[PDB]
Design a protein around this ligand. Structure first.
Ligand code: NAD
Ligand code: NAD
Ligand code: ADP
Ligand code: ADP
Ligand code: MG
Ligand code: MG
Lengths: 96, 400, 185, 398, 185
């Protein structure tokens, strides 16, 4: 079993994305990036796709065989998490 | 043991079928004499046993002279008590009209014992019959559940449930009074109650826009109905009846009021007493003939003929569904195979062997009792299974 | 004394056409908040969930419209499923081929019935790990069975700067602390 | 500290819950005798404490001879005032109608002393009970905020706030007059003020948000019965001129039916009308669906209020909030064994398995001052008060 | 003398068709221009901003349409976010799952409320870089953060003879002066 992470779903084969039975979709803002999710499954689910444009930072939309009905979830914050960030310019330029 | 036209099916299918039938336009429930044993009642066979054990002298004279009761049935305990009082009253009436003084002294003493024995098996509480708030005891726990389950599953624009019965006991009224629901029996007024045959067509509505009402029909009278010196039927309370005539019957050993009572189907030859039973039968036949009726039967021993005839005649309807409870299927089939059982056994076995999916008969002995029948009915989703009202009342009563 | 429904009715169905349902409210509600024995709930805003009392089942609908007819208020909703009781609990079926009748009441949904909708089997609860809470109410807890998540492929999407690596770390670390004998590369 | 159905709550959940209840269809407030302690008022215990030392010789008669008040309650300071006032009035009426001059002269001193003691604490400014603009001072700055908060939080097209009280002070009217808000107490007219029960069904309109309903359950210092069998109301200055200055500074109690406060003389056919109307209005108000009520400063020594409040929770949509400071001591005293009936009632209502009851305790977090801040402002509510600068500029230029 | 609202009203909500808000203007020409204590504002062209009062929040919307139905007049708009108090001031959020209720009132937004819409998170002032003023009104000053603007790459587009070099020179010189120890090529 595989887990696929990307920010450009358009750069994937129709076969590779359709194999999944679950789809955790976070905020996405682009016309060309929203057709793949719609085309992955046939009709009967439209009310959950219009929210994705204006989601906040932290929440997510999940639907699939692991849910009886689609759920909009607020994910926790794991501690400790990954690295905070890379180098920041102001501190290095202002060490003196 | 659930049978559908000569087959077998398990409990899950039966529950699904019951849930499906519990959402039709019309719903009716029929209760017999066996449903009152959970409070302290008795069945007619026990009544006959008590009669033949307590008063032995009159039994001998009831066979040789008048030849009204057969010798064989008395041993097998298949005596129809309800149809003996009618013949006794006819004999007494003709003897009195002919003015035969010596003949009355026997028929006026054999009816006192019968009414003494019959009444004592219907009080259902013994000496505690004249008191107040008799519906809060644990004996009547199931009747409230039955009434609530039947009432609380009707969508708007559908008829209120109808309950038929045969017993002349005071159990359903006591159970329904505690819930706070009013039942319709056709009688109106307080200081003078009279029967109104056109009163079965009224409901309740709110002036602003509660809707808690259910009908009740009794096919064999009740302990608190009587005929006065005039020609009219009247109804009183339990305390008043106990003060007037029940105590006199139960204690005084030389008391016979006469044709003052109304139970059970006793004096049907009088034209002012049959006007109730006629309307009862009319409404029963009109109800079971409706296009989309759904019916339940329990506690009914099939000892009559007209009710069975009416049911069978109504069975030739494409949209009539019936469910029957009979906890004697196997012991009856064993007798049927050899030479055939009694008339009730023959009737039930000849009805069951019909090749229809409409009829359904349930067996299993003690598994088909009233107690098990109570919870087979569905239960509302929003019905509160919590203790709130009974605790707030206790908290209020603690304030002082 | 005793009322059939422990929850206060709000409106009544006035008209039906099949696929959609029309509801009018009583004239005493203007504050868009309905109270019950548990607490306070919102009923009027679009995207919420309401219910109706019909026989021995409960129907769930979703609010889409709020248009004017003291005037009258109109609500249009569509059905998504129903709730049934079998032995001692509650089950949520995902078919909506049944509709209520005219004159039926519209009732809000408490937190108890909202937990049941977003729930799974009891025996699968011990082998499940939490993910988070609902966003409209911030009170329901959502679980997930690892048996069904890690069977087919799982797809995670999201733009730059909105928390996908955090979700990946949270999902991957929990299984490791749960089943010591497993392989992930 | 905070309990709701057996659990415990935090500050943010309490604040959010309070905000949500203020947007309900019906709102209500019940303020007790504690609300006036912050501006000069006195608690019921303090009145008896002062009366014990001011008038010591009369204490023996009330216990030894007539047997109206007992011993342990007096020692513990758990004695009422209204009940003994009523009993003394009844005794004096019987003595007067029986022609017993020996005992009749005794009760006049008792009643005069009691009424003087009550009045000397009823006032909130002392000698300035007759001057003008008493709402301009600083001690009445929280009632103004309460009124403004409870008025501004209503969506257009809704009802108006309702206020219930169990006091006989003049703080609320003095605060309401300064803002420019009219309160309907049920009376009408200026030269002859009269009580009409139908005046509580009135409202204002503009011919081309102003009004609230105030119900008093113990009368006031400005209500009295004249010779005509109709109750009348006067101003504070007129009351001081007529029948207020005499009790404090003189020894004269010849008006056994003139006064109307507090909760006494209920055996008359004219005084019971007002009490009955107010009590019926309060009892029938909280039977409405979608209602919310707050309770503050009111000790639960009244049986009928407790009974009706406990019986009103049977409805599915009744919500209450109670502020009771001395909460832990009540639990400690009832677990070990002790306390009065009020502690028993508050404990037996706190442990309920209901989500419609909230109890707040502490020492100074449950006072009247902190009750106002739990109520919010609208975002658009003006606060930059600059019109006062224009007012003083207008006044200075004359 | 007691005034609940010191800012004048314009209209009221009549319809909520999903994500759309319908508004009816009041009688007279006061719905075209409004005046308050600070100055003169207006709502007359698509692309303006209006607010809805809902207690603890102020929903901010953008208008799109305007037409006749003296007949009745209507306005359609869409939502952006809401404004609320935190400690002693205000905070702007850009989440648009919230809608007002029926019967509210719409008021114009003053200059004191356009400032908070276009401000920073109260801590990035020391690294603030000034660019210009907004075009629609010319009352709000725009800033930017050094740690977040010139951290990753950046794009300056446009046709010929329209001012690319001016922006380049302004940004470079302003960045150079803030810290005298920066390298640019
Ligand atoms: N011509 C008439 O008008 C007339 C006269 C007499 C009787 N009847 C009618 O009433 C009669 C009923 O009385 P019955 O004495 O014949 O017996 P029954 O029909 O009341 O009961 C059937 C059997 O059930 C047993 N039983 C015990 N507890 C039970 C429970 N909890 N649930 C179910 N069954 C239980 C009873 O002991 C046994 O009689 C017949 O049904 C019918 O004839 C009509
Ligand atoms: N005229 C009469 O009928 C009469 C006579 C005596 C008592 N009472 C009253 O006594 C009881 C009601 O209580 P009450 O309020 O009328 O008087 P009360 O003295 O019983 O209650 C006042 C309470 O408020 C508390 N408190 C004190 N300062 C406070 C503050 N700054 N903020 C908040 N709470 C504060 C006090 O500890 C406590 O005494 C009976 O229910 C009521 O009848 C009436
Ligand atoms: N659900 C969440 N709860 C709290 N903070 C979150 C959440 N999701 C993301 N963040 C925060 O967002 C910031 C950037 O998220 P990050 O995981 O780096 O995004 P990405 O992986 O898409 O680059 C970090 O401060 C991170 O902690
Ligand atoms: N923000 C501005 N305000 C006023 N004038 C401007 C602005 N930006 C550019 N200009 C004008 O544009 C001219 C510079 O154009 P320039 O950027 O050299 O053209 P190109 O984009 O072809 O390099 C200057 O004369 C200046 O007056
Ligand atoms: Mg990452
Ligand atoms: Mg260039």
């Amino acid at each position: 079993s595989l887990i696929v992470s990307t920010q450009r779903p358009s750069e994937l084969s129709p076969t590779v994305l359709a194999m999944c039975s679950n789809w955790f979709s976070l905020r996405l803002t682009n016309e060309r990036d929203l057709q793949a999710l719609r085309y992955a499954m046939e009709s009967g689910n439209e009310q959950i796709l219009k929210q994705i444009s204006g989601l906040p930072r932290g929440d997510a939309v999940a639907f699939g065989s692991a849910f009886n009905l689609p759920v909009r979830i607020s994910i926790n914050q794991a501690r400790p998490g990954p690295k905070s960030s890379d180098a920041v310019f102001s501190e290095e330029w202002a060490n003196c | 043991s659930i049978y559908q036209g000569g087959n077998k099916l398990n409990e899950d299918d039966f529950r699904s079928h019951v849930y499906s039938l519990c959402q039709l336009d019309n719903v009716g429930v029929l209760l017999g004499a066996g449903a009152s044993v959970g409070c302290g009642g008795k069945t007619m066979k026990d009544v006959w046993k008590s009669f033949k054990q307590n008063y032995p002298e009159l039994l001998g004279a009831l066979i040789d002279k008048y030849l009204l009761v057969s010798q064989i049935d008395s041993d097998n305990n298949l005596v129809n008590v309800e149809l003996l009082i009618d013949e006794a009253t006819k004999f007494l009436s003709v003897a009195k009209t002919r003015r035969c003084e010596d003949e009355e002294e026997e028929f006026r003493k054999i009816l006192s014992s019968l009414y003494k024995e019959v009444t004592k098996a219907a009080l259902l509480t013994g000496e505690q019959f004249r008191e107040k708030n008799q519906g809060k005891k644990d004996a009547f726990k199931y009747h409230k559940e039955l009434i609530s389950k039947l009432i609380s599953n009707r969508q708007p624009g559908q008829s209120a449930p109808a309950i038929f019965t045969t017993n002349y006991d005071l159990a359903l009224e006591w159970a329904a009074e505690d819930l706070g629901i009013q039942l319709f029996n056709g009688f109106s007024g307080l200081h003078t109650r009279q029967f109104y045959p056109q009163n079965f067509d009224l409901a309740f509505r709110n002036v602003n826009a509660g809707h808690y009402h259910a009908y009740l029909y009794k096919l064999h009278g009740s302990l608190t109905w009587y005929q006065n010196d005039s020609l009219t039927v009247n109804e009183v309370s339990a305390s008043q009846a106990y003060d007037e005539y029940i105590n006199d019957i139960i204690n005084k050993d030389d008391f016979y009021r006469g044709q003052h009572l109304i139970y059970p189907g006793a004096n049907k030859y009088s034209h002012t007493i049959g006007f109730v039973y006629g309307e009862m039968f009319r409404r029963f036949g009109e109800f079971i003939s409706k296009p989309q009726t759904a019916l339940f039967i329990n506690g009914f021993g099939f000892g009559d003929y007209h009710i069975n005839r009416i049911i069978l005649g109504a069975l030739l309807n494409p949209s009539f569904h019936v469910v029957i409870y009979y906890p004697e299927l196997k012991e009856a089939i064993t007798k049927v195979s050899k030479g055939g059982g009694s008339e009730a056994e023959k009737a039930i076995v000849t009805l069951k062997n019909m090749a229809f999916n409409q009829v359904t008969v349930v067996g299993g002995g003690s598994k088909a009792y009233f107690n098990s029948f109570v919870e087979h009915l569905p239960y509302p989703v929003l019905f509160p299974r919590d203790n709130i009202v009974d605790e707030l009342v206790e908290a209020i009563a603690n304030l002082s | 004394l005793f009322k059939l429904t422990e929850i206060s009715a709000i409106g009544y169905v006035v008209g039906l056409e099949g696929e959609r349902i029309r509801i009018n409210l009583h004239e005493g509600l203007q504050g868009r908040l309905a109270s019950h024995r548990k607490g306070v709930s919102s009923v009027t805003q679009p995207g919420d969930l309401i219910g109706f009392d019909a026989g021995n089942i409960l129907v769930v609908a979703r609010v889409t419209d709020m248009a004017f007819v003291i005037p009258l208020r109109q609500i249009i909703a569509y059905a998504i499923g129903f709730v049934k009781r079998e032995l001692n609990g509650y089950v949520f079926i995902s078919e909506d081929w049944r509709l209520p009748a005219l004159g039926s009441s519209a009732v809000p949904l408490t937190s108890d019935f909202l937990n049941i909708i977003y729930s799974i089997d009891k025996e699968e609860l011990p082998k499940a790990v939490e993910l988070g809470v609902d966003s409209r109410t911030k009170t329901v807890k959502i679980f997930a069975s690892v048996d069904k998540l890690l069977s087919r492929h799982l797809a995670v999407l999201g733009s730059t700067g909105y928390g996908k690596s955090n979700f990946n770390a949270l999902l991957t670390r929990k299984v490791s602390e749960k089943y010591p004998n497993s392989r992930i590369v």
